[PDB]
Design a binder for this molecule. Structure first.
Ligand code: CL
Ligand code: CL
Ligand code: MG
Ligand code: MG
Ligand code: MG
Ligand code: MG
Lengths: 377, 378
């Protein structure tokens, strides 16, 4: 009859997510000056420290430490009390930096990537992940627009949804449980925190049709949460790959995104298969769809592209695959040009590094822009 | 009508995996002295540094620094040239000790979450062939390094296997190994030709069934060149950064929760272990060719919100009837999992062994969640 699914997100001040954001801020800065930059930038944080390391090949002149402090400060790490003083903490820069036909650019590694789409939301994303990520984005918004000025940067959001399976399609019935644990200042009671999260975060984000008299709300269930981020903890880039993708739905190729230029198939491969899956569902060819691409090291053309519609396809899966191959170029150098991926600056990649790479209504997320696929007559 | 699937493993010297191992060594030490220990121990590594932190409630008296150095030395980090000098590197012990301060049936889930268990008839391990081969290639590299069959090996590296499959009415049927990639750390004098020949002879040949290999299988053996230093050197690692390698190599839905450094009162770990045991028991009992079992916990509640099974239409009986059998033969209450799978036993490398080369599909009797129950249909 029904089944449950749960997805979680962490806020922009969670230490792992901080690392993802710093890594993508460094990518953005390199690409702004040099679109041909090669970037493999990781960030590690712990009490009073942020370290950036990895390999960059660029013509860009970048002040890495300045990017680190400005990113941390902008998230809200302005003091030891919040959990990191962006301007006084230790910053270590251990990046190894050097100077330096799109059809012929090979995959840099062997790997595979999955893209998922589902008609259950207008974002064509799983409702569990849409709600978890939009709750976190709304927490950040209401902090910065001073609706809830008592908020601090760290926290987590989690949603459990009850579903029916309708001949392979996922049909959300109701939100079972909402959990929010948010960092806050000393000046608000637990009562005020819970009341404000219901009014200013939950009510705007969760469609009323999914809430009922039995939905469970867990609002700061583990108690007071005044300090956060790096303090007494650690984070690394690429430690939240389920949050970055589909919140647990579908098979996983394992590759992490942030700090990688788009010559890296972990990122460009994942983006193109989301675009393909999303396009299949948007075009009415299936209610739900997973698209896989597999790359061989040094080869431009994928080993294989595969589609599965979970028996929801309006035409056979092999016939959808013909349309996907007609309209999508999986060669990595061609993905980078077609999806305009070599553009940075104006937070292009830093935006992807919290609250999910997918499901975003933002034209910079070019992989969210559907192609309208019509079978040939 | 075939498709490809790829899984990867990293070797015990990979910095993330080193962290997992150190976290689980600390867990082992605490549980050996105090089976009721509460442990949430994470490890971070970078050049010349290992840091352990988190919260522990224990009656144990543990030399945390000695555990860290012994773990790293046994992995093979015996000098700075290897990528970490376990004997004199910086070790920071930042664990918060809480002083010690209930029926097992009444122990609630400590947070909200869900966990998936997977099994498939395609291997005797009842695991996906991609992941069996990737993890067994890594385990074999460690074996031949330490017994000096291939003494030139060093601890870091990765293994990757791509398999061609057919879908037989929802069952996964491996046809052949398409590509094998091995990237291993090694000493300063061994040659590339010796590395390739010994990897073929002593690692690939013993691990991969000959029936899957043919004249077209591709081998990439240290494709990116020389690899003498590794581990933490010029890198970083953290516990719980390799959750796909720890589980099923990409197959199935993922609940997101990491395992190492967590005592078994943590449903991320106990929950994942019991649903592996359940899925494995369904397939071993011939009730399905392939099965995923999901458990969902409510914060503070011992009984799961729900248990769910999907056989991908390969069940011999209806999925709802398999679910009745699962609930009759498995106790999903976390306190009862811990007792029934003897999870509070630590020491003797019990959890450290889980921390590299996969928590599932292992023949070691410490992996109590790999023991099959016969499920008789009614
Ligand atoms: Cl700098
Ligand atoms: Cl020291
Ligand atoms: Mg990859
Ligand atoms: Mg005509
Ligand atoms: Mg020495
Ligand atoms: Mg969890």
């Amino acid at each position: 009859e029904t089944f449950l699914f749960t997805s979680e997100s962490v806020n922009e001040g969670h230490p792992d997510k901080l690392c993802d954001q710093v890594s993508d801020a460094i990518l953005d800065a390199c690409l702004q000056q040099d679109p041909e930059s090669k970037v493999a930038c990781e960030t590690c944080t712990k009490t009073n420290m942020v370290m950036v390391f990895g390999e960059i090949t660029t013509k860009a002149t970048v002040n890495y430490e300045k990017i680190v402090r400005d990113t941390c400060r902008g998230i809200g790490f302005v003091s030891a009390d919040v959990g990191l003083d962006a301007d006084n903490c230790k910053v270590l820069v251990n990046i190894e930096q050097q100077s330096p036909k799109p059809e012929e650019i090979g995959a840099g590694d062997q790997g595979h990537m999955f893209g998922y789409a589902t008609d259950e939301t207008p974002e064509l994303m799983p409702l569990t992940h849409v709600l978890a990520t939009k709750l976190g984005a709304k927490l950040t918004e209401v902090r910065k627009n001073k609706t809830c000025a008592w908020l601090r940067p760290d926290g987590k959001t989690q949603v459990t949804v009850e579903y029916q399976n309708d001949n392979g399609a996922m049909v959300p019935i109701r939100v079972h449980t909402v959990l929010i644990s948010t960092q806050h200042d000393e000046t608000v009671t637990n009562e005020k925190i819970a009341a404000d999260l219901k009014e200013h975060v939950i009510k705007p984000v969760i469609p009323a049709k999914y809430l009922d008299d039995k939905t469970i709300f867990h609002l700061n269930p583990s108690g007071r949460f005044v300090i956060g981020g790096p303090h007494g903890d650690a984070g690394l880039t690429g430690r939240k790959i389920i949050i970055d993708t589909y919140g647990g739905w579908g098979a996983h190729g394992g590759g992490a995104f942030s700090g990688k230029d788009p010559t890296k198939v972990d990122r460009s491969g994942a983006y193109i298969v989301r675009q393909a899956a999303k396009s299949v569902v948007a075009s009415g060819l299936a209610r739900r769809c997973i698209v896989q691409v597999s790359y061989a090291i040094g080869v431009p053309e994928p080993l294989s592209v595969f589609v599965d519609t979970y028996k929801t396809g309006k035409i056979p899966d092999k016939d959808i695959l013909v349309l996907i191959k007609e309209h999508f170029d999986f060669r990595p150098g061609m993905i980078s040009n077609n999806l305009d991926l070599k553009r940075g600056g104006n937070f292009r990649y830093q935006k992807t590094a919290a609250y999910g790479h997918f499901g975003r209504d933002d034209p910079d997320f070019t992989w969210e822009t559907v192609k309208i696929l019509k079978p040939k007559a």
